[PDB]
Point group: C3
Chain length 336, copies 3
């Protein structure tokens, strides 16, 4: 497609929503290829990542950790306006794993405080894909400070299973998983810093242990629990997109399954089925499709259970509806 | 319907200790059945290495791992779980094969002196982890040995990707356990009077994400020496492998995984000709192999530090005739 | 085949080349089955693995870490002459994951200094496969000292995608990824030793933490950057073989993709497609096929970014050609 051809394509401006929600889209593409426009301001901000009050200086695309999910269709163009406000102290950029060239866009989007840039790429491959910050020489520090999210490049025809049957979800959630490396004092208590750069040396030491102090969903321990639990109903079809930009994870729906799981995240790779626990390598996104059959509380976890229940990587689903005794029943309740 | 489920046959099955598996048929015998199992949970001090290191283990049916239960797709598994009054802790069970109530965990919380009976329909074919999961103390029970697996065979037995039958002559269940044993200032592993005394010290070790031991069948060397698994040349063997908490990467040294259901799910077509497969923590996998050479094999987690320094190494002793076409020493070690 | 049948097959002596290059070979088999002869001399040598002058006592098959890629076709015989020179101090051997019996050949190739052996095995299974040293009682030590490489057993008809279309590479590269465990003194400086055995006790202690001090490609930090950057051009099809004999890795071509990825490394298992980041478990090799579409510098990494950019696991590709503005364009360059 020539420059003139692309200029004639229709533009749609998308308003992003905060994870774990996803902006309005259609599963099946409406019309021909479009240039889909997004804007994100990068915020360097203090975030609290557990109930004790532990804080991190985060790099937060659109002001959240993870950054928001951008959704386009195959052969659309994604056109991102990225802004680094003058209140920030560091240079930032963006690497789209969905994109082709210039280190995923990273080499073309280095913006100092008070600068902006507009990057356009053709989303040639269908799937979910990580994006993250990657300033040369400081790449892992920015990513494990929360500077990451994902996009979904839907097939123009929507999702299908491995054999041509249409899969249509009723709702979608995006779970970004973040490994944090928080320095401690000699008493074992987490340290606080005045500016991001003050934490650098101490944080690099922790990073080198390859052992996160915290592993969280949506930026904090318990962020997707309580009144922030994800919800569904018996019979409802849900797609769960999960990303990890730096470190392996193994998602599991406690009480459910992944009926179809694109564990590599790429829709031209047929999904695994009937999954108990799937595996997403660091630097990737995956997606899992499930139809709820039972009501009640579910936990969605990284099934290294230490990571889930000691380090923070557990969310809840609240599910409404009628219990199915054929699928499961307590023949004898706990009794003497 | 309600009448139809109640009229299905009930069948009690006697369990056996890993790595062996109780009696079953690969192709389902009859229509759907309710397969009944009973397991008593034993809290017991087990020795896990050659230095006398102890762990207060949670042992479904008296073993780490708990035994393999085997049913067919659309059978019901009906487990009676018993927690004797001599135990100190509440326990329960989460079947990854099951649907609802946190895998059954929500319905099976039994204090010492209690029992429960859980039924679920095995709707999905594959091998699946089960483990204890008391709310608020889930990892502690699991890394204390409270885990095993089940196999839900397709009603028509196993098949390859093109649909030809795969029929094993024997089956072994290897449960892999990451343990996190506290050490004192001098580097000696600590011992405790009761399970709860170890809790605080153990969680500290757990948070390093670095096991002190990684073992098969509950201890370093449990499946080596005189306890090696066996086969013969020409024999087809299915090896079911589970890890309820932590990744592993099985490898049969001297062999391969001819077909590997690496995700453990039989509606997902098996990978083939595998050197080393990968099972994420929280899952089981299964590998089918036909032995072609006699001799000693090692079956390991192929992080070789985990295998040979931390304990995740088993043996197969295989009888039969050596095949010089497949391998031959042209010139033996010589100066 | 009988012993007589094998004796009658053509012999072909191959001359090995150092990683990341691969010796001359045909993708499609030239003729019927042959016995492909290789020779390698094991060298115990010091290698410097970072810019702080950190040393490892390496076990180098053919003088390199990793050892070289050996290439045959399915149902050929690989015949290795392995030589342990008198100048070495330790017994060594070799286990081919591609082979069947005697612990991959390890039980038949145990050679003290001043000894040699010849092993022949039938390459019955197509794929990329680890090989490594494994002296009973000292296995992990030899492997994490650099005693590993890989082979490729091509299908006789070359590579194909999942539907039987031919996949033919113009270039091939072999990246061996190595986890090292280097002891430190009490002030954090890496220790040096005058003999391999002198470092055993100290090294075993570090190995037991399951935390490498270094994770590198081709034996050292930056080994595959600068004078040793891999090269390609726009339009060229490139196969990247990647091995890790002891520890998981998650390769990613920054700016690119794995168009087809045999993540398990086995060619009768259909490849994944459109991959961002693939996964190779410790003890295995994998392979990725990609057609370059953009020029410039790509980084090729283990996408645990701490492992890539703090511990050493990053390579570069230098790619010539014309930039493609359809696939990617800077609409607005970084600016106030
Ligand atoms: Cu940044
Ligand atoms: Cu990346
Ligand atoms: Cu328990
Ligand atoms: Cu579980
Ligand atoms: Cu060696
Ligand atoms: Cu090996």
């Amino acid at each position: 497609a020539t420059a003139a051809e692309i200029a004639a394509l229709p533009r749609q401006k998308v308003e992003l929503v905060d994870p774990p929600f996803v902006h309005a889209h259609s599963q099946v593409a409406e019309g021909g290829p479009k240039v889909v426009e997004f804007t994100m301001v990068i915020e360097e901000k203090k975030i609290v990542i557990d109930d004790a009050g532990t804080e991190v200086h985060a790099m937060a695309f659109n002001g959240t950790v993870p950054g928001p999910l951008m959704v386009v269709h195959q052969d659309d163009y994604l056109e991102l306006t990225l802004i680094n406000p003058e209140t920030n102290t560091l240079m930032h950029n963006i690497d789209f794993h969905a994109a082709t060239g210039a280190l995923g866009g990273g080499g073309l989007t280095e913006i100092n405080p008070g600068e902006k840039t507009i990057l356009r790429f053709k989303a040639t491959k269908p799937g979910v894909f990580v994006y993250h910050c990657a300033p040369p020489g400081m790449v892992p520090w920015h990513v494990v400070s929360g500077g990451n999210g994902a996009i979904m490049v839907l097939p123009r025809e929507g999702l299908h299973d491995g054999k041509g049957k249409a899969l249509t979800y009723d709702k979608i959630y995006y779970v970004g998983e973040q490994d944090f490396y928080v320095p401690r004092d000699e008493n074992g208590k987490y340290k606080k810093y005045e500016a991001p750069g003050d934490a650098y040396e101490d944080t690099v030491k922790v990073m080198r242990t390859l052992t996160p102090t915290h592993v969280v969903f949506n930026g904090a321990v318990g962020a997707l629990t309580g009144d922030k639990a994800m919800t569904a109903a018996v019979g409802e079809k849900v797609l769960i997109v999960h990303s990890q930009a730096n470190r392996d994870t193994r998602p599991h729906l406690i009480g459910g399954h992944g009926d179809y799981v694109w564990a590599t995240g790429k829709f031209n790779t047929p999904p695994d089925v009937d999954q108990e626990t799937w595996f997403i390598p660091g630097g990737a996104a995956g997606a899992a499709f499930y139809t709820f059959q039972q009501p009640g509380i579910y936990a969605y976890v990284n099934h290294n259970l230490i990571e889930a229940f000691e380090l923070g990587a557990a969310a809840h689903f609240k599910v409404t509806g009628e219990w199915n005794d054929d699928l499961m029943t307590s023949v004898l309740a706990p009794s003497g």
